[PDB]
Design a protein around this ligand. Structure first.
Ligand code: 5N6
Length: 363
């Protein structure tokens, strides 16, 4: 596998990289992102978001800083946890969490976290140049239906999707002040105007849900979400673009995530040549438990063949994760091609998994 962001050899002399992201563009360009964790693995630290772009199918890469932090605090200023999408116009949107103080985004404050915001950038030239940062949360003019009891929120970490009519849907996570406690939940946001403005959906049925992605299936949203301390990825389905949810049994509890906290993973849809819609999930098996997050695996379900059990396709990273921070992954599928980026011992690695797709596609 190619080392895409190398802690030991990179243009920022960053000590560590985390939270990778990938989009395969229609024209065969590969666009990736990662947290530049300049000072080490810590989440609560000085972080910008890098891009790496390839026009030769992942042989060589161009690097840039896609989004800088607010530069307020040289210890704690951070933009992080990229969620991305390509719209029907080809526009590339990136949404990041922004903070500049110490302490967990969800749990530190009992009121709206004062240094918190959600920052958005877009590219109209296939990720060559970006807009200025747009602040989605400083006022009420960009994101409708934000709960008054919001502590904070950011994207679900991974990729969003486009509905048939062109509506953009992004996975999100929120922290809500409820009866003297902070509870965190998954949900979605959507845009009908190419990302200019958004509406927030409602929270999923269970707290302790966070990082997630959704696919579209026949107008429904199906979510695969990190469900902390359950030992598995939860799955829910919405028939009303994220207003209401119920358990989605065929995926709920089917991907096991081992002892301790959950882990980010990715969940995408592919349509094979026989017309079957398949779901692909990347996540660590975490057989060793907690933050070890060993064995980043790829799993498959066939929505058009639900009595067939979820199958492990391959294990792109058959190694222990680094306990300081590892395990995260992102798939992208486009035009019969499949690629993954994942965390590997403080680096980001890249693999083309198209050969595995060919095995599934049968042919
Ligand atoms: C913004 C942030 O803090 N993101 C980090 C996230 C998070 O802290 C964890 O979901 C716990 O959030 C809650 C809701 O309690 O989780 C990771 O620390 C991890 O590797 O698990 C890496 C990731 O950048």
């Amino acid at each position: 596998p190619l080392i895409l962001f190398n802690k030991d050899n990179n243009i920022w002399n960053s000590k560590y990289f985390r939270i990778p992201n990938i989009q395969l563009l229609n024209d065969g360009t590969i666009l990736t992102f990662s947290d530049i964790r300049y000072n080490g693995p810590d989440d609560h630290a000085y972080i910008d978001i890098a891009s790496a772009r390839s026009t030769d199918f992942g042989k060589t890469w161009s690097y840039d800083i896609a989004m800088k932090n607010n530069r307020i605090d040289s210890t704690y200023s951070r933009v992080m946890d990229s969620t991305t999408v390509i719209t029907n116009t080809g526009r590339i949107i990136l949404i990041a969490g922004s903070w500049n103080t110490n302490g967990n985004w969800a749990m530190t404050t009992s009121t709206r976290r004062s240094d918190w915001s959600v920052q958005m950038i877009y590219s109209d030239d296939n990720g060559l140049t970006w807009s200025n940062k747009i602040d989605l949360t400083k006022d009420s003019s960009k994101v409708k239906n934000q709960p008054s009891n919001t502590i904070g929120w950011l994207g679900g970490v991974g990729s969003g999707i486009v509905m048939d009519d062109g509506t953009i849907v992004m996975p999100a996570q929120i922290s809500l002040r409820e009866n003297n406690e902070n509870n965190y939940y998954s949900l979605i946001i959507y845009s009908k105007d190419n990302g200019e403005t958004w509406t927030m959906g409602n929270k999923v049925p269970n707290s302790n849900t966070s990082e997630n992605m959704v696919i579209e299936l026949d107008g429904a949203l199906i979510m695969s979400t990190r469900y902390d301390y359950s030992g598995y990825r939860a799955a829910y389905i919405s028939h009303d673009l994220g207003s209401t949810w119920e358990i989605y049994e065929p995926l709920n509890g089917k991907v096991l995530t081992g002892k301790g906290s959950g882990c980010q993973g990715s969940f995408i849809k592919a349509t094979t040549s026989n017309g079957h819609r398949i779901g692909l999930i990347s996540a660590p098996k975490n057989t060793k438990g907690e933050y070890i997050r060993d064995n980043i695996a790829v799993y498959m379900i066939d929505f058009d063949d639900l009595s067939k059990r979820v199958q492990e396709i391959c294990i792109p990273y058959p190694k222990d994760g680094n306990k300081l921070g590892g395990g995260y992954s992102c798939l992208s599928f486009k035009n019969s091609h499949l690629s993954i980026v994942y965390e590997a011992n403080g680096n980001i690695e890249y693999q083309d998994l198209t050969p595995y797709y060919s095995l599934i596609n049968k042919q």
